[PDB]
C-alpha cells in the first residue's frame, strides 16, 4: 500500500497508510460513510488493527447487497442471509487457527 | 498558462465511472415506460406545452442534459426511433445494462479493448441467433398483419381501441405503397398524413380514401359538393405580377393607361381560358388567385382553392392521379386529375374542411383523428406512427421474432452455451453481455408487479429445454406463457436494430477515458 498525504482543515500534514488515521483526517460528510467510519474507529479502539479490512469488507458487502437488490431480492432477505453467513463464518474461523 | 482558463480536463477511472453512471441514469429515467402495463409521463415543454406520453423517444427528446454521455444516449434513442420506429425504450435499457456489466469488469484490471472485442463477438452471435429463431410471415394474410400491429401497439394508450387503430394503420400503409420504374417505396413520411381535429369521439377516427385539407372555396358561388370532379393542380399564381427584369413604362398618350389595365385583364382572361380548355371541375393551386380569375372560372362553373401547401398538393396529386403544372398554356389531358370519386367542403366545428375522399386506387391518404383534446390526439398520432412503422418494417422484411422477452432469453441461453468453448479471457465479458439481455424480461416482470427473481429463475430454467425459444413472460399477468399461443411477436428488423444499436452504444462509451471541455468553437 502507498502512503497518502492528507491536509486537514488546520493545514496539518498527515502522510500515512493507516486507514483509521486517513478516515479521521478526512472531512466525511455523507452519513452512511460516517457510520462505516465509526465502525472502523470502533475496530481500531477494540483491537488496534484491521480498520482497512473493516472498510473493504463493508464496501464489498454493500456492493453485493446492491446487486442482490437489483436482481430481485428484498432488503430483509439480504440482511437475514448476511447475518446467517456471518454466524457461519464466526463458527468456521476457530478451525482455521494454524 | 498553456491551455485557456476555462479549459477543464479530467481522466482516468473517474471518467469511465461517470459515463457509465450517466448512461445508467438515462436508462433509469424511462425504465417504467416499457411493457403493456407501462404508465405515462407528463413532460412540460419549455415553450409552454404539455407532452403526455410513454414513448421512449418522445420522453427523452424533451430532456436537457449536460453530461455528454447522456447526450450520446439521447442520440441513440433518436437513431433507433428514426431507423425502425419501435423499440426505443428497449435499446436505452439494453445499453444501460451492458454498460453496467462492462463497468463491473473495468473495476478490475481488464482493459476496455478486451471488453469491446468480447462485445462485438457477442453481437455477431446475437445477430446469428436472432436470424436462426425467426419465422416467416405471409403478408397476403391480413390477420397476421393485424396481429403484428396489435402486438406493436398493445403497450400504448391506443390499446383500448386496438382493432380500429390496427385497421387504420394497415390500410394507410397498404394504400400508400407505390412502385415506379422498378423501384418500390412506402413513404409514410411525405404521404399518409395524420391530421387531428380535437373533439368528437375516438371511435369516429378513420383513414380517408383520399386527402382532406383545411381549406374553403375562394368565394361562395362555386359548388361545395361535386360528384366526379376533374381536378387540375397548379403551382403558379393566377394573377398579374411583375417580371424579373427592370420593366419601367413611359406613358405619353391618353389611352395608354386604360390599355395597360385592359391588357392586365385580358392576360387574366387568357390564363383562365387556357385552364378552362381542359373542361375541369376543381382547380387547386399553390398560390393566390385573383378575383377576376375567380369570376372567369365561375363562368365555366369551376371550384377553385388557393394557397395550398406544397406537401398537401403533392398528396392530392398522388391521391387523385394528377400532375402539378406551372404554365396553364402547357396543360395536357394527362395532367387532369381523374379518379377522385367525390369532393365535398363541409364544416367541422367552426372551420371548413375540403374532402377528396372517394378516389379509386389512391396512392396517398389522410388519417383523420378525433379525440378528447390536442394532447390525447398527439399521443394517438405517435401511437399510429409506431403502428405504421412496424407495419412497413414487417412488410419489407417478412421475418418475425417472438416477443415478451422470449427472444432475449433464447439469445442469452444460446450465447451462454457458446461461451463454454472459449477458454480465454474474453469469455467472462461475453457471458456477462449475454446475460445482460435478461433485463428486458426483468423489467417486464417488474412493471407487471410480480416477483422478479422467482419468475426469472423459472424462465431461465425453461429456456434450457430442447424447444422453448418462444417462451416469454405474460406482461399483464406475470406468468410464463408460450408466445405462439399468446400471440405477441416482433419484427426481426426491430430486434436486430435494437441489439446492434445498444451494443455499439456500449462500445462507443467504453472507448473513452478522457474528457476535456470549456473551449470555444473557434469558428
Amino acid at each position: 500500500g502507498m502512503n497518502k498525504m492528507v491536509i486537514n482543515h488546520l493545514e496539518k500534514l498527515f502522510v500515512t497508510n493507516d486507514a483509521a488515521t486517513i478516515l479521521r483526517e478526512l472531512e466525511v460528510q455523507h452519513p452512511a460513510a460516517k457510520m462505516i467510519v465509526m465502525a472502523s474507529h470502533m475496530q481500531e479502539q477494540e483491537v488496534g488493527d484491521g480498520t482497512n479490512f473493516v472498510l473493504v469488507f463493508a464496501g464489498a458487502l454493500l456492493e453485493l447487497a446492491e446487486e442482490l437488490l437489483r436482481i430481485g431480492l428484498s432488503v430483509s432477505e439480504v440482511i437475514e442471509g448476511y447475518e446467517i453467513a456471518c454466524r457461519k463464518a464466526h463458527e468456521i474461523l476457530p478451525n482455521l487457527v494454524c | 498558462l498553456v491551455l485557456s482558463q476555462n479549459t477543464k480536463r479530467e481522466s482516468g477511472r473517474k471518467v469511465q465511472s461517470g459515463n457509465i453512471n450517466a448512461a445508467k441514469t438515462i436508462a433509469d429515467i424511462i425504465r417504467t415506460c416499457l411493457g403493456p402495463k407501462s404508465m405515462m409521463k407528463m413532460l412540460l415543454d419549455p415553450m409552454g406545452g404539455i407532452v403526455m406520453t410513454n414513448d421512449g423517444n418522445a420522453i427523452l427528446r424533451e430532456i436537457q442534459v449536460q453530461h455528454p454521455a447522456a447526450k450520446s444516449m439521447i442520440e441513440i434513442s433518436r437513431t433507433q426511433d428514426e431507423e425502425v420506429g419501435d423499440g426505443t425504450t428497449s435499446v436505452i435499457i439494453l445499453a444501460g445494462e451492458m454498460l453496467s456489466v462492462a463497468e463491473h469488469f473495468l473495476e478490475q484490471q481488464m482493459h476496455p479493448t478486451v471488453v469491446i472485442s468480447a462485445y462485438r463477438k457477442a453481437l455477431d452471435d446475437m445477430i446469428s441467433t436472432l436470424k436462426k429463431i425467426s419465422i416467416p410471415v405471409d403478408i397476403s394474410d391480413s390477420d397476421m398483419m393485424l396481429n403484428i400491429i396489435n402486438s406493436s401497439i398493445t403497450t400504448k394508450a391506443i390499446s383500448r381501441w386496438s382493432s380500429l387503430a390496427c385497421n387504420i394503420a394497415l390500410d394507410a400503409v397498404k394504400m400508400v405503397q407505390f412502385e415506379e420504374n422498378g423501384r418500390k417505396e412506402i413513404d409514410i413520411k411525405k404521404y399518409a398524413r395524420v391530421e387531428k381535429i380535437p373533439g368528437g369521439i375516438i371511435e369516429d377516427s378513420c383513414v380517408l380514401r383520399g386527402v382532406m385539407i383545411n381549406k374553403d372555396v375562394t368565394h361562395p358561388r362555386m359548388r361545395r359538393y361535386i360528384k366526379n370532379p376533374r381536378i387540375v393542380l397548379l403551382d403558379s399564381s393566377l394573377e398579374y405580377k411583375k417580371g424579373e427584369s427592370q420593366t419601367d413604362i413611359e406613358i405619353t398618350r391618353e389611352e395608354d393607361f386604360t390599355r395597360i389595365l385592359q391588357m392586365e385583364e385580358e392576360y387574366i382572361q387568357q390564363l383562365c381560358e387556357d385552364i378552362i380548355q381542359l373542361k375541369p371541375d376543381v382547380v387547386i393551386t399553390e398560390k393566390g388567385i385573383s378575383d377576376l380569375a375567380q369570376h372567369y372560372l365561375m363562368r365555366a362553373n369551376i371550384t377553385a382553392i388557393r394557397r395550398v401547401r406544397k406537401t398537401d398538393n403533392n398528396r392530392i396529386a398522388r391521391a387523385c392521379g394528377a400532375r402539378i403544372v406551372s404554365r396553364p398554356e402547357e396543360l395536357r389531358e394527362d395532367d387532369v386529375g381523374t379518379g377522385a370519386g367525390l369532393l365535398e367542403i363541409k364544416k367541422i366545428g367552426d372551420e371548413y374542411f375540403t374532402f377528396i375522399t372517394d378516389c379509386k386506387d389512391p396512392k396517398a391518404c389522410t388519417i383523420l383523428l378525433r379525440g378528447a383534446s390536442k394532447e390525447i390526439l398527439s399521443e394517438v398520432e405517435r401511437n399510429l406512427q409506431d403502428a405504421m412503422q412496424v407495419c412497413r418494417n414487417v412488410l419489407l422484411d417478412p421475418q418475425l421474432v417472438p416477443g415478451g422477452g422470449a427472444s432475449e432469453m433464447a439469445v442469452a441461453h444460446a450465447l451462454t452455451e457458446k461461451s463454454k468453448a472459449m477458454t480465454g479471457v474474453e469469455q467472462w465479458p461475453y457471458r456477462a453481455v449475454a446475460q445482460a439481455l435478461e433485463v428486458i424480461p426483468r423489467t417486464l416482470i417488474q412493471n407487471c408487479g410480480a416477483s422478479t427473481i422467482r419468475l426469472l429463475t423459472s424462465l431461465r430454467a425453461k429456456h434450457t429445454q430442447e424447444n422453448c425459444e418462444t417462451w416469454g413472460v405474460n406482461g399483464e399477468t406475470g406468468t410464463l406463457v408460450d408466445m405462439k399461443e399468446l400471440g405477441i411477436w416482433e419484427p426481426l428488423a426491430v430486434k436486430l436494430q435494437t441489439y446492434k444499436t445498444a451494443v455499439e452504444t456500449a462500445v462507443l462509451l467504453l472507448r473513452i477515458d478522457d474528457i476535456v471541455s470549456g473551449h470555444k468553437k473557434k469558428g
Binding site: - | 498558462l1 498553456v2 491551455l3 485557456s4 479549459t7 480536463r9 471518467v15 455528454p68 447526450k71 450520446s72 442520440e75 437513431t79 428514426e82 431507423e83 482493459h111 476496455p112 469491446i116 462485438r120 415506379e180 420504374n181 423501384r183 417505396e185 411525405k190 403551382d235 403558379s236 417580371g243 424579373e244 427584369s245 427592370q246 420593366t247 419601367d248 413604362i249 413611359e250 405619353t252 395608354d256 390599355r259 395597360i260 391588357m263 396529386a317 400532375r323 402539378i324 406551372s326 404554365r327 395536357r332 446492434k500 444499436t501 455499439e504 452504444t505 462507443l508 473513452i512 477515458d513 478522457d514 474528457i515 476535456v516 471541455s517 470549456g518 473551449h519 470555444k520 468553437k521 473557434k522
Partner: protein, 532 residues
C-alpha cells in the same frame, strides 16, 4: 532600465517554461497512442460533443495560448496534411526531443552543439531506415495493403472490424486509381465521397461502385430511378431569364409588354428543350431550378437535381464522361447542346437511408468511381468512423505510391535507438551526447505503447532493445530487425510476419518535422511579452 511595457523572461526560466508547455501538450495526447489507446471526448462549452482519437483533431480543437505549445499544434496539423498518419507520434517525439535537449542545455552543453547533434542524428536515422529497415511491397501483394490498412485502423473505433473495413478501403483506393503523364499511378484520395448516416451496425456500411450524392430530386413528380442514365452536368441555374444590370426595359407601346414577359420565360424553356432533345435522363446543376423548369423535367420523365456541390459535380462528370457546361454557347455564337456532352451510368437511384434519401449514381462508364456510406449508432460515432476511414485511406495511398513499408510496434524506434547509440561514439565530442539523447528520445513510442497497455514498460523495452542489439551485432541474426511489441500479450513479436506495417514516409516525415520543431523551439533563450 529597459522600460519595455511587457514581461521579460530569460535564461533557464524561459527554456523550462517552453519545455513544460511542450510536455503538457504531449501528455494531453500520450494516452491515445497504439491499439491499447483510448479515445477522448471533447465538449465545446455549448453542448457540442466530439469523440475522437486523432491527435491532430484533438490539438486543433483545443484552445492553446503558449507559443511553444502552438508550435506543436501546427506541427501535428502539418503532419496530418503532408502524410495523414502519425499525427500523435510526431508530437510525442518532438516533446521528448525538446525535454532531453533542455536537460543537455541545463548540463551546460551549448544549444548549438545539441542542434548539430540532432541534425546529424536525424540524417543518420533517415539513412538507416532507408537502407536497413524498409520492406518492398512487390513480393507481399494485396496482403501488404490489407495489413497496412488494418494497422492504421487499430486504435480507432473501427479497429476490431478491420477485417472488413480494410477490404473496403483497399477496394475504394484501387477503384479511384488513375495514371498521369510520366507513367506514375496516382491515387487521388478525397475523391472518395464519405457519407455518414446513423442507423444499422458498422458492418452494414456500403461501398458504392459509383458515386453517392447527398441530394434529392427537386420535384416529387420525377421518377426516382432511371436505368440507362444519360447524365447532363450543368453549371448554370435554370430559372426565369432576367436581364443583367446594364440592360433596362422601357415600354412606350403597350402591345410589346406581353411579348417581353412571355419571352422572359420562353428563353429558359427553349434551353430546356435544347437540353432534353438529345436524350438526357439525369440533369445535375450547381444552381437552382425554379418550379416551371422542374415541371418541364417532370413531363419529360427525367431526373433533375439542384444545388449540387461543385466538387461532387466535377467528380460525377469525370467518372461518367460528361462535360461541365457553364453555358450553352458554341464557337458559332449559337445556343446548342450536343450528345457528346452526356455522361452515362448503368443506373441512377434515390435510395432511402434511415429516414432520409440520397442519390446513388451506380456504375459510371468510362471511369470507375467509389463512395462509402458509413452506418453508425449516432452522429459522434459516424464522425469518428469518418476520421479513421480517412486515416486508413491516406495510409493506403502512401503505401501504394511509395512502395516501401517498415515494421510497426516500435521496432523502427528501437532499431534506430540502438544504431544511433552505437553511432554517437564516432562523431564529434559534444554532439555525441546530443546524438545519444536523440537515440534515447526515440524510445518514447514503445514506452508509451507499453504504458497504455497497462504493462511493465521497462522490461519489455529492455527485451526489445536486446533483440535489436543482437540483430545489429550478429550478421546472421539480421532477421530480428522486425521484432516489435505485441500489445495484447505483452511480448516481443516479429511484426513483419504479424502483419503490422506502416509507410516509410510516415516515419521519415515524422522524424524530420519533429527534429525541425525541436530545433526551432530550442533556439529561444529570451521571451518578451508585450502587454495588449
Amino acid at each position: 532600465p529597459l522600460s519595455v511595457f511587457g514581461d521579460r523572461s530569460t535564461g533557464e526560466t524561459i527554456r523550462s517554461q517552453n519545455v513544460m508547455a511542450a510536455a503538457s501538450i504531449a501528455n494531453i495526447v500520450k494516452s491515445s497512442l497504439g491499439p491499447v489507446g483510448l479515445d477522448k471526448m471533447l465538449v465545446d462549452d455549448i453542448g457540442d460533443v466530439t469523440i475522437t482519437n486523432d491527435g491532430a483533431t484533438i490539438l486543433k480543437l483545443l484552445e492553446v495560448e503558449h507559443p511553444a505549445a502552438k508550435v506543436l499544434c501546427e506541427l501535428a496539423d502539418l503532419q496530418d496534411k503532408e502524410v495523414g498518419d502519425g499525427t500523435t507520434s510526431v508530437v510525442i517525439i518532438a516533446a521528448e526531443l525538446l525535454k532531453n535537449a533542455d536537460e543537455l542545455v541545463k548540463q551546460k552543453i551549448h544549444p548549438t552543439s545539441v542542434i548539430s547533434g540532432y541534425r546529424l542524428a536525424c540524417k543518420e536515422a533517415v539513412r538507416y531506415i532507408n537502407e536497413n529497415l524498409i520492406v518492398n511491397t512487390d513480393e507481399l501483394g494485396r496482403d501488404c495493403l490489407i495489413n497496412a490498412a488494418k494497422t492504421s485502423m487499430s486504435s480507432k473505433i473501427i479497429g476490431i472490424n478491420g477485417d472488413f473495413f480494410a477490404n473496403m478501403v483497399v477496394d475504394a483506393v484501387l477503384a479511384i486509381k488513375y495514371t498521369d503523364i510520366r507513367g506514375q499511378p496516382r491515387y487521388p484520395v478525397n475523391s472518395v465521397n464519405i457519407l455518414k448516416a446513423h442507423g444499422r451496425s458498422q458492418m452494414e456500411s456500403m461501398l458504392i461502385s459509383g458515386y453517392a450524392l447527398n441530394c434529392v430530386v427537386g420535384s416529387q413528380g420525377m421518377p426516382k430511378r432511371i436505368v440507362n442514365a444519360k447524365i447532363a452536368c450543368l453549371d448554370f441555374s435554370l430559372q426565369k431569364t432576367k436581364m443583367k444590370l446594364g440592360v433596362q426595359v422601357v415600354i412606350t407601346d403597350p402591345e410589346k409588354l406581353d411579348q417581353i414577359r412571355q419571352r422572359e420565360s420562353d428563353i429558359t424553356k427553349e434551353r430546356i428543350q435544347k437540353i432534353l432533345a438529345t436524350g438526357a435522363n439525369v440533369i445535375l446543376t450547381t444552381g437552382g431550378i425554379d418550379d416551371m423548369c422542374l415541371k418541364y423535367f417532370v413531363e419529360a420523365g427525367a431526373m433533375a437535381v439542384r444545388r449540387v456541390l461543385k466538387r461532387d459535380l466535377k467528380r460525377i462528370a469525370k467518372a461518367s464522361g460528361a462535360t461541365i457546361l457553364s453555358t450553352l454557347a458554341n464557337l458559332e455564337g449559337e445556343e446548342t447542346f450536343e450528345a457528346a456532352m452526356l455522361g452515362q451510368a448503368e443506373e441512377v437511384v434515390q435510395e432511402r437511408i434511415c429516414d432520409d434519401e440520397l442519390i446513388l449514381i451506380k456504375n459510371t462508364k468510362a471511369r470507375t468511381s467509389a463512395s462509402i456510406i458509413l452506418r453508425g449508432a449516432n452522429d459522434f460515432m459516424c464522425d469518428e468512423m469518418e476520421r479513421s476511414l480517412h486515416d486508413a485511406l491516406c495510409v493506403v495511398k502512401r503505401v501504394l505510391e511509395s512502395k516501401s513499408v517498415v515494421p510497426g510496434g516500435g521496432a523502427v524506434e528501437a532499431a534506430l535507438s540502438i544504431y544511433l547509440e552505437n553511432y554517437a561514439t564516432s562523431m564529434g565530442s559534444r554532439e555525441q551526447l546530443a546524438i545519444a539523447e536523440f537515440a534515447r528520445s526515440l524510445l518514447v513510442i514503445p514506452n508509451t505503447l507499453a504504458v497504455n497497455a497497462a504493462q511493465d514498460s521497462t522490461d519489455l523495452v529492455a527485451k526489445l532493445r536486446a533483440f535489436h542489439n543482437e540483430a545489429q551485432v550478429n550478421p546472421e541474426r539480421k532477421n530480428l530487425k522486425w521484432i516489435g511489441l505485441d500489445l495484447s500479450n505483452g511480448k516481443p513479436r516479429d511484426n513483419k510476419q504479424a502483419g503490422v506495417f506502416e509507410p516509410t514516409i510516415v516515419k521519415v516525415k515524422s522524424l524530420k518535422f519533429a527534429t525541425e520543431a525541436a530545433i526551432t523551439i530550442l533556439r529561444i533563450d529570451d521571451l518578451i511579452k508585450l502587454h495588449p
